[PDB]
Design a protein around this ligand. Structure first.
Ligand SMILES: Cc1cc2nc3c(=O)[nH]c(=O)nc-3n(C[C@H](O)[C@H](O)[C@H](O)COP(=O)(O)O)c2cc1C
Ligand code: SF4
Ligand code: SF4
Ligand code: SF4
Ligand code: SF4
Ligand code: FES
Ligand code: FES
Lengths: 61, 127, 238, 178, 437
């Protein structure tokens, strides 16, 4: 969805004993590049389980 | 009806059994799916006690010999089903309040179930 | 060469070619799930329904992947009855399809998925929007089931085209998949293990839903993200 | 299985044109079905080998029909009709009583191992509704609490239904009231 | 009497039964000792294939299954000798509900049938016939296997016949039930030992079919009726009923009717005549009648309904058709929902899964509507839904099973709607049937 190509998600296959995600598939790598990003919020709306949800911290630098 | 609550509690029962029989014989337990109405919940509050919509007991070869599915929240004829594959045997548990989990009118109990499992297992399994 | 008119445009079409192709040739279009290239039609998925004229229409909608072509034929794929019947079929197929798009590794490249968005138009100016009219429990069976070191098999997903079975019977000549029970209960399964054949794997591309997937590439990226590089296989002299 | 039974093979293979080999699956199965009371994998793998076809095909064919079985049966495989006519003569209620007496429903076996139960759809003898079929032995026409309990009491006492009789009257091809 | 021969009158003579109920009539020698097998001898030594076609095409015979296709035309498609085989398949898996005419034909007077297949065989130059007998009919399957050995031993069903040069044989192939296997194309697969699903329709078996070689399928009645035709002339046949509605038919009945069974009545007869004169009136007044088969859709119990003929040309126009003549009477004690509930839980069971519309649609969507209505968890919404579902199913199947499953529920919402709307809208379950003895 993104217009900055700022969210890279490498998927991975869920452990059956210690699942770190409720579904059968998870995100072993989830990276987000802030210095690229524009802060649209199309990501959150596109995410169907609403996992990525924009914050309130903003004092980043 | 409040049948809902008993139905889900009965679904816990089926699960409970599946772990014991499974570990007893060395035949596998496996979660198949988890509810859409859990995965995709994210602001509607969750209330149910398990997350598992479908689950199975598998043999040494790796094919299932018993499938076990509950109906989720949405349903209009809410039931729990069993199915032996290849055999064309399909069992429908309804709930009748207080009576129990019944297949029609016969109570489904643990002992009943163990026998059902064994007749499945012994017949269908290759391993 | 035989003179066909689809809607309002004409096509030449060498004699005895399925209507479906003459449709696609003319630039109008129909959905279709059961008939892949280089495989016989056994018109079964009931999607490729048109209405046909020869002027007089017909009392029943012919499946264009099946019937031959003839003189001055009209084939209609815009009409109120056509779209309506398609809307129907989309919905019907989807009746037992379990929800999994985001984790379905068939991704943005799923014939069911896309067909739905292409054709499934009910009636909804200023009304409520409508979605699935089913409201009873779905089928549930096993899934994520390895058939072989190279092919994982869901059994929930499938839409019961014949493509994979059909292929195995016609083309490598070895049968290793065939339908099991009947009615709604039916499901594809095996009774030979490992899928022996040097040609087992092709069905993976052939399945037009995400039921049949490539185990070597199970969960290693979503379908679209890949850069798709045409090249030639050199591990043999073919 | 058919290793001892080789006349039976010649017998069923002979009936067809040689190029129509696949036909044999129905009879070959049907022999296994009557005589051991429910097919087993080995049988199907052999049947497959014999007719020169992969197991999976033979599995698909075998698994289609209504009659064939694949689990532990009892001694008396009880086949109750559930279609329209039969409903109108109270076949519904029969299945309620039957099942609740015996203690088991579909695809299960009785603790003695003399009774499996299974539904079936229109058996085509609507006029003398209801009916049951036990194993493959002719139709027990009519069922009434008596007629039933007599059938039961005989089976329970070590006699089939072909060798005992029941009260009532059920006609040849006309019969009376309902 | 006379050329419009309807009802019981002195000039109509029974022939399809007159031996059933009298046990010990399945001997070759019992049959023979009635003067039987003359008629086979006659056709074989006299007439050509063309003539035994041409005669029947006039006779008024027409399909006697759950189909009506004038049988002359059905033989007309035969290639009439090229060097290719031909096979005649007697479809004795009539297992559509409410129907049981065929059962006894097989059981008590087999040698009649067999003679009919010798006659038919000769006409279309076919040399082998399969009789696909319903699997659960055990009695019939014994008696047929038995009959065929007898007849073959004494050599009228042999590898050369008479002073002639026609030769014919039969094989029994005991089925395994399963309604859908009855369909004419399904049968050819079923018999061939593949999984049973219908074939496409641009080849007709006549023009190419079973193992490449052209096949013909005919129904048990159709075949039995060949003997009277060939015996006594086409004229003797033509008298029975109105024209295009010739011949007699083995009507059957059930429900709470006083004397149900098979009543061999001429065609064009009224229901009134059957239910009263013959079957001794009802036992409870009727809610609806499903006239013939289970395919056809119910008709309310009406005076104008009772008085309509039984044919393929008067029931046609009344928004029904005639199945197998197996009428069912539905009493008004029970609920129409509960009737159709049972009917469409049957149809759903017996689908083949090949089509989407009927796999998923009927056996998964539609049926559950019924459940919903008839458990009192129903609503007006569900009948509104159902209504709209019907044009989406009828068209779109690949074989005619679906259309037989929709019509009853189609017809039934026009006439009995009220009850459906009742039980749903009011959240009221069906009452139970109260008629188990
Ligand atoms: C869905 C379907 C099911 C059928 N089932 C039967 C059957 O069980 N028995 C039968 O004799 N004919 C059945 N038929 C019709 C026959 O295949 C065949 O068309 C017809 O019997 C030929 O006419 P005749 O049998 O009156 O000569 C069926 C047809 C369809 C479309
Ligand atoms: S807000 Fe999200 S969608 Fe938008 S640029 Fe940022 S990472 Fe992308
Ligand atoms: S798994 Fe795919 S190819 Fe096979 S029948 Fe199913 S939808 Fe078709
Ligand atoms: S197969 Fe297709 S329609 Fe089904 S869950 Fe996968 S992406 Fe979705
Ligand atoms: S209409 Fe039904 S029973 Fe007939 S071919 Fe289609 S799925 Fe099969
Ligand atoms: S592509 Fe035509 S019915 Fe499937
Ligand atoms: S409904 Fe039971 S034998 Fe026909």
């Amino acid at each position: 969805a993104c217009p900055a190509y700022a969210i890279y998600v490498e998927p991975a296959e869920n452990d059956p004993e210690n699942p770190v995600s409720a579904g059968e598939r998870y995100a072993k790598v989830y990276e987000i590049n802030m210095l690229r990003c524009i802060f649209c919020g199309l990501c959150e709306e596109a995410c169907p389980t609403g996992a990525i949800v924009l914050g309130y911290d903003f004092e980043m630098a | 009806a409040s049948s809902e609550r008993e139905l889900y509690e009965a679904w816990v029962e089926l699960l409970s059994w599946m772990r014991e029989y499974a570990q007893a014989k060395g035949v596998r337990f496996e979660k198949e799916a988890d509810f859409p109405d859990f995965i995709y919940r994210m602001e509607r509050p969750y209330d149910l006690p398990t997350t598992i919509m479908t689950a199975s007991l598998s043999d040494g070869l790796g094919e299932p010999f018993l499938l076990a599915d509950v109906s989720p929240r949405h349903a209009k004829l809410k039931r729990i089903g069993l199915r032996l594959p290849r055999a064309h045997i399909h069992l429908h548990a309804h709930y009748e309040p207080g009576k129990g989990l019944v297949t029609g009118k016969i109570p489904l109990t643990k002992e009943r179930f163990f026998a059902l499992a064994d007749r499945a297992r012994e017949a269908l399994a290759f391993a | 060469m035989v003179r066909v008119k689809v809607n309002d445009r004409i096509v030449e079409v060498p004699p005895g070619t399925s209507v479906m192709d003459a449709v696609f040739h003319a630039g109008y279009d129909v959905p279709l799930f059961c008939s892949e290239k280089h495989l016989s039609p056994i018109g079964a998925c009931r999607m490729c329904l048109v209405r046909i004229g020869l002027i007089q229409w017909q009392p029943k909608l012919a499946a264009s992947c099946v019937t031959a072509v003839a003189d001055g034929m009209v084939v209609d794929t815009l009409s109120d009855v056509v779209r309506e019947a398609q809307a129907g079929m989309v919905e019907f197929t989807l009746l037992n399809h379990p929800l999994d798009c985001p984790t379905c590794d068939k991704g943005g490249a799923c014939e069911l998925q896309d067909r739905t968005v292409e054709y499934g138009l009910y009636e909804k100016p200023l009304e409520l929007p409508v979605y699935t009219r089913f409201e009873f429990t779905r089928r549930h069976v096993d899934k994520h089931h390895p058939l072989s070191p190279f092919v994982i098999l869901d059994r929930e997903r499938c839409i019961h085209c014949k493509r994979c079975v059909r292929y195995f019977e016609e083309v490598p000549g070895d049968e290793v998949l065939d339908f099991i029970e009947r009615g709604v209960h039916t499901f594809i399964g095996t009774m030979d293990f490992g899928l022996p054949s040097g040609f087992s794997g092709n069905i993976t591309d052939i399945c037009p839903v995400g039921a049949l997937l490539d185990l070597t590439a199970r969960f290693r990226a979503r379908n679209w993200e890949m850069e798709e590089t045409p090249t030639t296989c050199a591990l043999c002299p073919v | 299985f058919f290793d001892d039974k080789q006349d039976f093979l010649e017998e069923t293979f002979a009936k067809y044109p040689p190029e129509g080999r696949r036909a044999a699956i129905m009879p070959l199965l049907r022999r296994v079905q009557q005589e051991e009371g429910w097919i087993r994998p080995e049988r199907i793998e052999e049947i497959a080998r014999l007719v020169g076809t992969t197991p999976t095909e033979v599995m698909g064919v075998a698994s289609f029909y209504s009659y064939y079985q694949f689990v532990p049966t009892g001694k008396y495989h009880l086949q109750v009709c559930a279609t329209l006519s039969c409903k109108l003569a109270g076949a519904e209620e029969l299945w309620d009583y039957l099942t609740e007496t015996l203690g088991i429903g579909p695809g299960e076996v009785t603790p003695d191992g003399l009774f499996s139960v299974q539904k079936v759809e229109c058996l085509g003898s609507c006029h003398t509704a209801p009916v049951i079929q036990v194993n493959d032995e002719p139709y027990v026409e009519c069922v009434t609490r008596a007629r039933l309990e007599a059938l039961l009491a005989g089976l329970r006492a070590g006699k089939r239904l072909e060798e005992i009789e029941l009260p009532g009257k059920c006609g040849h091809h006309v019969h009376e009231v309902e | 009497t006379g050329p419009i021969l309807s009802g019981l009158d002195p000039r109509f003579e029974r022939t399809l039964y007159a031996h059933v109920g009298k046990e010990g009539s399945w001997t070759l020698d019992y049959y023979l000792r009635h003067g039987g097998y003359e008629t086979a001898k006659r056709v074989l030594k006299e007439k050509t294939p063309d003539e035994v076609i041409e005669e029947v095409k006039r006779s008024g015979l027409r399909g006697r299954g759950g189909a009506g296709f004038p049988t002359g035309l059905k033989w007309s498609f035969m290639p009439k000798d090229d060097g290719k085989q031909h096979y005649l398949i007697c479809n004795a898996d009539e297992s559509e509900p409410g129907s049981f005419k065929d059962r006894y034909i097989l059981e008590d007077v087999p040698h009649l049938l067999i003679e009919g297949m010798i006659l038919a065989g000769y006409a279309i130059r076919a040399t082998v016939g399969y009789i696909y007998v319903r699997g659960e009919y055990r009695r019939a399957a014994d008696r047929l296997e038995q009959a065929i050995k007898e007849a073959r031993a004494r050599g009228y069903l042999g590898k050369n016949l008479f002073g002639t040069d026609f030769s014919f044989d039969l094989h029994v192939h005991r089925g395994a039930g399963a309604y859908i296997c009855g369909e004419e194309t399904a049968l050819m697969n079923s018999l061939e030992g593949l999984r049973a699903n219908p074939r496409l329709k641009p080849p007709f078996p006549a023009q190419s079919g079973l193992w490449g070689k052209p096949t013909t399928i005919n129904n048990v009645e159709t075949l039995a009726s060949v003997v009277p035709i060939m015996e006594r002339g086409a004229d003797w046949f033509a008298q029975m009923g109105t024209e295009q509605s010739k011949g007699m038919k083995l009507y059957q009945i059930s429900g709470p009717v006083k004397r149900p069974g098979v009543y061999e009545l001429p065609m064009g007869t009224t229901f009134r005549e059957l239910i009263y004169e013959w079957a001794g009136g009802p036992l409870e007044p009727i809610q609806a009648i499903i006239p013939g088969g289970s395919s056809t859709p119910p008709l309310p119990f009406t005076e104008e309904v009772l008085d309509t003929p039984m044919s393929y040309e008067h029931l046609q126009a009344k928004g029904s058709m005639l199945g197998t003549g197996g009428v069912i009477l539905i009493p008004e004690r029970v609920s129409m929902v509960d009737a159709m509930w049972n009917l469409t839980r049957f149809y759903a069971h017996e689908s083949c899964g090949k089509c989407t519309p009927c796999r998923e649609g009927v056996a998964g969507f539609m049926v559950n509507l019924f459940a919903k209505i008839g458990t009192g968890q129903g609503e007006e919404k569900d009948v509104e839904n159902l209504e709209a579902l019907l044009p989406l199913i009828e068209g779109r199947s690949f074989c005619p099973l679906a259309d037989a499953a929709v019509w009853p529920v189609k017809g039934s919402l026009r006439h009995f709607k009220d009850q459906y709307l009742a039980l749903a809208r009011e959240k009221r379950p069906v009452p139970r049937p109260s008629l188990w003895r």
